[PDB]
Curated annotation (Swiss-Prot), chain B:
Belongs to the ATPase alpha/beta chains family. GO terms for cellular component: plant-type vacuole; proton-transporting V-type ATPase, V1 domain. This is V-type proton ATPase catalytic subunit A. The keyword ATP-binding applies. It comes from Citrus unshiu. InterPro entries: ATP-synt_VA_C, ATP-synth_a_Xtn, ATP_synth_asu-like_sf, ATPase_a/bsu_AS, ATPase_F1/V1/A1_a/bsu_N, ATPase_F1/V1/A1_a/bsu_N_sf, ATPase_F1/V1/A1_a/bsu_nucl-bd, ATPase_F1/V1_b/a_C. One of its GO terms (molecular function) is proton-transporting ATPase activity, rotational mechanism. GO terms for biological process: ATP metabolic process. Its EC number is 7.1.2.2.
Length: 463, 603, 52, 467
């Protein structure tokens, strides 16, 4: 091997402003070379070199630029991009936003260093998702299903129980099983959460007994804002290593996707870049793509990555740039309703916008029923017509609902009452739920049904 | 030869670049990354590096290729997935088992070792060939019939023509000599991608693009070689429409390119086209995958290469056009290309004219769209190829005031307006009849007249019915379900039928997967003729009661025929043209007879 | 009859007129600010950097 | 003219970016000096000198900047501004954006060279538009008439058939005075200049003027969208100069059709951004108003010559609005505005002209006793008032209810219906004289009672109420 070399140690910082430290007289820089700045007081912090020009090099530190002296701070060039020591032993532990251990345990002994921001899977190599996932929630598996490799987020405004829903999904997660060594190895990114929520997550995962197969990546709001952006990267790097190069399927969870976007806006505004909508950086589509567009089933390997992010509509508006880009990229969405939450429904999923783009392949002959697609279509379409009936009744009166409209309103009411609701630990299997789903479909006349053919449901039999 | 001076994301500045000319391919770093000169200042120059720039170091070697951006447009590209720089994905994966895309690989555009059955044409020794002359043809595979043509800007007399047989791409075939010098040609042809492939003369198009979808085929048609735009806000999944067009178009070849498209979608394309077959007049089973090429680079790929992806796609489509075929292209998510332009220009600090997008956005987008059309090809024989461009402009936030949408709708000929309302209601096509508009109606008038003169009249009547339905919906919402005129009620009726049956296709069921044009004409004629009969009944019914007031009673007594009208969409096209035309004849005549007899009854 | 007509008019107003106008005002405010102010300030900053 | 000098030839290109090249060590560089660029490959491009400072000179390139290199690019300084060749032979020919002929014929044998942006006319020597032309379109002819030397821009948006109506106007251009009007001098000599038009629209226009039989009269300048942008900023100036010669120094009435002013504004914005100066409203160059004024004010009758220029620049509202800088400044400058309405297009009326926002400032002078009947102005005023009151009444009936509408309310709605049905609607080739159109307008007006026609003076009513 070519002879080793020790890192250069510079002191020529020649200007500081904002989150940027400017160097000079640098001999042989490297773009995105990771630098570990040591201040005069002796403390250390890291950062990235975002631009290289001439002998100059512009560094954006991690822990902030406070307390840096233009004549006493020393910069060292590791000469490599950021690498996370991924290993199989990383399971069942917790880490800070930067990945430092926080589980009162020893640092990870790496099997092999893997550069984060890894190269894309060859598009030809990528294969379509084909197997359903038992998240442990009824309404997700019954309609708007999930395939083992399909990405789909959870849309939920502020104040909604989406974090509790994520915890329930993580603890109740499992394969359909219709094994354990290669079973779901859940990676749980945590991008910018409150300390109370962090303690909630830690206690829920520790007590659940799933800590034997789950790795957390906690990052609080008190952490440096830039450290928030590398978190959902380190998490996906570890997920890629565990799934593709280690075999076991991974069900990655990202929390507060909006917080990552806020972390991006702050960093970009500091960098003084061209702004997109709402002042968010223009290339956010690219950087949300680099995060989302990783889950999938590579052909040459039996692993599988499944992506379940959680967003947060800032103004409770789906037209906000973050949900807009997500819905452009993420292949479907699960929607949570504030009004249904007000109606005291624990899983307040609003089925009208809750669609799975890959549900057509999630259903099949290996799993579900031959009428699953038709039942989903009917219970997804008649709900909108029942909502329109409710609106017409509101704008005219109770007598406005005719013999057909009244049936739609009753269908909507019974649907919001029985089918959607579920227990806090309800593993309602597909068939028992689809029975009452067809009961709801049969609340409406069995011949008035327009889209569905009666023979498809006739393949199924009542009782 | 040269060395790097500044690196800033995709943009890289190299020093000692004195002889460099604009838009000349360049090799950067020990990994020899692809780059194109964009801005030259002094001895230095600006390079956009299509590969990922992370990890560069100052004084990395910079090598001039002296050649602008070029694609190897020889035979064999059909049925192969190519990157934005047109590198072969499958060969890369086979050569390096690592499924991850390597950085620094130099796989050639096409294999130099494939043997192709080469059939020389009627050309003879000493014949005066010119640029674009089909000296021969070659069979890449079934239904390819690849025509090897002399590259333009080449002429001479045939000093030697190769005999029929298998040939490597190194092998010379023609040895024409123009100015005494005997120049030897081969199958490989490289084209400056930015400069369009020349044509003899552009000309008007009058062959409609048959999508197989009722709404687009009838309401807002497009001609072969036309230019189309599909905004498709988030949640619409326009890619299903694009894939349906690719599968069931009448085009000779499909060039699908996805800039910013999801990797899953390309996986779906490559995994579903080979099984799906199209029936040619010979009738043999044949895979669409051979008819289709994929130039897409996923969203994970560097954004510097969006422009290269789109231009390689358009030049490959042009190359197939000059072969005499009719080729259609879909450019998924050109909004990703707009964001790529913004990101590149942002580093150059060019002043943002509008919403961050550089000023020279309309120019580039207009060039890309204007490369489309139907042209008379060069050389002999007298080919008339065509390129159809159907792009996509995803509106950030779903607002059509977006600059990319503004420029596209300014320069596009036919516009298909997707809407969030129909998508939410699970309509499936989600093609809004209002905002969508086709400027090709005048051109296709001759085709409509020769096919069926009734089509234009029923089309105008359907448009009027839809507009009246929208106006009546607004008026009713303002006032209420009360005080609905019997004529207005009958107008809202069968407009609901239009929306429920003709304007919507399942797109995932065997019957609604592909809608033949004749059955679409029959279905529109049935709906509009029922409407006309209703108007006639309103005119005379032995009093205003039987005329129009009893339209509800008519619906009660004609319920079976109305149900037949709404179910006529459910029938599959596999029954064949005679079965469908006979069924539509009997349905129309039964409807007319029952309506007239019931109109005769009590009147 | 008069009370029915008046109640219908009032309900129609409350359900459609304001419920459409308020989104129109919100969209106008959002477009005006986040486009004109943002891009004008960006242009001014780019000019300042050019002079610098 | 005793002795001349041969042009200088510098090989210095200190910088190339965008559509611009930055020459250095150029001694004695004129402003708007026209330069010819000989590349290394030998190809020749022509461009203009945007600004001069010291030895530096910013040169914009018409044919784009896709091949320049420092080592081998050579540039010559002709020491003059653009001077397009002009002659009577320029008629009946089609030219590229820069003026290079593309009719497969020979280049123009010049009668003279005219500097672009010709000499400013002494305002005390201009004259108001004297006579008006009959446009054939009922909406244009009856309201907001077009006078010889009037500046009427047609305001349209994407999809609206502004090109089709432009071709129709080119077909129906004709005089109206007392219905009296070879007329080779009176021949309108249409100078149609289109910038950044779709190739389909280009073929459409070419075939339309080829078939119309006016090929011996019309003259087309084209700068397509795929053509370089910089060429588009000169094309309308070339058209105006050619029109000025063919009208003033050649004694012919000349009509000018400029297409897609939004495209011209786009080229202006591109040039400004490439030069990197302070932007204006919506990032546009701050002097866009001056450019539009100089591109518009070059039309009108002139006292000392028998010719005239009447221009109809069709304009595209970008987002279907008017507060946009281009339509706003055009309204500030142009003395008229004709609107094409998306609502009219939705109901499928081939001419979608909405008369309510449409207005001509010089309509009163355009209409004359010889030009039209004495009641023509009364017809226009009555139709305006009736249409406005009918729209307000339709809104009132919508809010309160159709039944609640009064008798005069139903009368106004019926007037709106018959107006938008018979009056505005016209065929693809409907070409009717002004008099019968005014008579049918009096039929529509007499549908209303005499008392409701309060705006109409009584004398004109008695003249043309019963008829």
């Amino acid at each position: 091997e070519g002879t080793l070399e020790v890192a250069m140690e510079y002191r020529t910082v020649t200007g500081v402003a904002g989150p940027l430290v400017i160097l000079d007289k640098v001999k042989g820089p490297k773009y995105y070379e990771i630098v570990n700045i040591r201040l005069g007081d002796g403390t250390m912090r890291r950062g990235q070199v975002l631009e290289v020009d001439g002998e100059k090099a512009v560094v954006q530190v991690f822990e902030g630029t406070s307390g840096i002296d233009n004549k006493f701070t020393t910069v060292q060039f590791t000469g490599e991009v950021l690498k996370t020591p991924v290993s199989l032993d990383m399971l069942g532990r917790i880490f800070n936003g930067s990945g430092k251990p926080i589980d009162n345990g020893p640092p990870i002994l790496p099997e092999a260093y893997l550069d984060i921001s890894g190269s894309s899977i060859n598009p030809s190599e990528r294969t379509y998702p084909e197997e359903m996932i038992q998240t442990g929630i009824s309404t997700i598996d019954v309609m708007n299903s999930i395939a083992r490799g399909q990405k789909i987020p959870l849309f939920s405004a502020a104040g909604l129980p989406h974090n509790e829903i994520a915890a329930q999904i993580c603890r109740q997660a499992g394969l359909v099983k219709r094994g354990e060594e290669d079973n779901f190895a859940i990676v749980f990114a945590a991008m910018g959460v409150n300390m109370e929520t962090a303690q909630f997550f830690k206690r829920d995962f520790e007590e659940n007994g799933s800590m034997e197969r789950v790795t957390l990546f906690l990052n609080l709001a008190n952490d440096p804002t830039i450290e928030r952006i590398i978190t959902p990267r380190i998490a996906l790097t570890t997920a890629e290593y565990l799934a593709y190069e280690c075999g076991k399927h991974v069900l990655v969870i990202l929390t507060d996707m909006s917080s990552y976007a806020d972390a991006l806006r702050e960093v970009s505004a500091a960098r003084e870049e061209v702004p997109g909508r709402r002042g968010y950086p223009g290339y956010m589509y690219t950087d949300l793509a680099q995060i989302y567009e990783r889950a999938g089933r590579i052909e040459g390997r039996k692993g599988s990555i499944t992506q379940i992010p959680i967003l947060t509509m800032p103004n409770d508006d789906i037209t906000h740039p973050t949900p807009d880009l997500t819905g452009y990229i993420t292949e479907g969405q699960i929607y949570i309703d504030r009004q249904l939450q007000n109606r005291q429904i624990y899983p307040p999923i609003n089925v009208l916008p809750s669609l799975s783009r890959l549900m057509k392949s999630a259903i099949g002959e290996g799993m579900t029923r031959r009428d699953h697609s038709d039942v989903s279509n009917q219970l997804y379409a008649n709900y909108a017509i029942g909502k329109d009936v409710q609106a017409m009744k509101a704008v005219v009166g109770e007598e406005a609902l005719s013999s057909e409209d009244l049936l739609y309103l009753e269908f909507l009411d019974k649907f919001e009452r029985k089918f959607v609701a579920q227990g806090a630990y309800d593993s309602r299997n597909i068939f028992q739920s689809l029975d009452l789903a067809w009961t709801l479909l049969r609340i409406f006349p069995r011949e008035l049904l327009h889209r569905i053919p009666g023979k498809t449901l006739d393949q199924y039999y009542s009782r | 030869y040269g060395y790097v001076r500044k690196v800033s994301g995709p943009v890289v500045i190299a020093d000692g670049m004195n002889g460099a000319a604009m838009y000349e391919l360049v090799r950067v770093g020990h990994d020899n990354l692809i780059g194109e000169i964009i801005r030259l200042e002094g001895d230095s120059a600006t390079i956009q590096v299509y590969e990922e720039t992370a990890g560069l170091m100052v004084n990395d070697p910079v090598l001039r290729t002296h050649k602008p951006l070029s694609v190897e447009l020889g035979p064999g590209i059909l049925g192969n997935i190519f990157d934005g720089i047109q590198r072969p994905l499958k060969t890369i994966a086979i050569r390096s088992g690592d499924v991850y895309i390597p950085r620094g690989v130099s796989v050639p555009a096409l294999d130099k070792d494939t043997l192709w059955e080469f059939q020389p044409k009627k050309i003879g020794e000493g014949d005066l060939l010119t640029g674009g002359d089909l000296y021969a043809t070659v069979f890449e595979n079934s239904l390819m019939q690849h025509h090897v043509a002399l590259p333009p800007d080449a002429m001479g007399k045939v000093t030697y023509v190769a005999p029929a047989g298998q040939y490597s791409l190194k092998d010379t075939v023609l040895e024409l000599e123009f100015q005494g010098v005997k120049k030897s040609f081969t199958m490989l042809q490289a084209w400056p991608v930015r400069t369009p492939r020349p044509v003899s003369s552009k000309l008007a198009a009058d062959t409609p693009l048959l999508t197989g979808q009722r709404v687009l085929d009838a309401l807002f048609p497009s001609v072969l070689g036309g230019t189309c735009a599909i905004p498709g806000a988030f949640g619409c999944g326009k890619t299903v429409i694009s894939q349906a067009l690719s599968k069931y178009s009448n085009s000779d070849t499909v060039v699908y390119v996805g800039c910013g498209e999801r990797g899953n979608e390309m996986a779906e394309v490559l995994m579903d086209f080979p099984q799906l077959t199209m029936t040619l007049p010979d009738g043999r089973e044949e895979s669409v995958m051979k008819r289709t090429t994929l130039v897409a680079n996923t969203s994970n790929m560097p954004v510097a290469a969006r422009e290269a992806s789109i231009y390689t796609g358009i030049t490959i489509a042009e190359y197939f056009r000059d072969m005499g075929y009719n080729v259609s292209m879909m450019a998924d998510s050109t909004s990703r290309w707009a964001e790529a332009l913004r990101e590149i220009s942002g580093r150059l600090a060019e002043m943002p004219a509008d919403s961050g997008y550089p000023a020279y956005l309309a120019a580039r987008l207009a060039s890309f769209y204007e490369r489309a059309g139907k042209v008379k090809c060069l050389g002999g024989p007298e080919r008339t190829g065509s390129v159809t461009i159907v792009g996509a402009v995803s509106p950030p936030g779903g607002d059509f005031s977006d600059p990319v949408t503004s420029a596209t709708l300014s320069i596009v000929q036919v516009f298909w307006g997707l809407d969030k309302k129909l998508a939410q209601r699970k309509h499936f096509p989600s093609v809004n009849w209002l905002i969508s508009y086709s400027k090709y109606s005048t051109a296709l008038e001759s085709f409509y007249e020769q096919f069926d003169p009734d089509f234009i009249n029923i089309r105008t009547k359907a448009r009027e019915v839809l507009q009246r339905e929208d106006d009546l919906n607004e008026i009713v919402q303002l006032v209420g379900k009360d005080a609905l005129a019997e004529g207005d009620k009958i107008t809202l009726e069968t407009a609901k039928l239009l929306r429920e049956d003709y304007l919507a296709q399942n797109a995932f069921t065997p019957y609604d997967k592909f809608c033949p044009f004749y059955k679409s004409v029959w279905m529109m004629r049935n709906i509009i003729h029922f409407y006309n009969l209703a108007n006639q009944a309103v005119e005379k019914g032995a009093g205003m009661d039987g005329q129009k007031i009893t339209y509800t009673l008519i619906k009660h007594r004609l319920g079976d025929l109305f149900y037949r009208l709404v179910s006529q969409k459910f029938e599959d096209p596999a029954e064949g043209e005679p079965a469908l035309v006979a069924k539509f004849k009997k349905l129309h005549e039964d409807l007319t007879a029952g309506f007239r007899a019931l109109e005769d009854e009590t009147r | 009859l008069t009370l029915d007509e008046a109640i219908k008019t009032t309900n129609r107003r409350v359900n459609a007129l304001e419920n459409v106008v308020k989104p129109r005002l919100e969209n106008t405010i959002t477009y005006i600010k986040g486009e004109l102010d943002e891009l004008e300030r960006e242009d001014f900053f780019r000019l300042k950097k050019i002079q610098g």
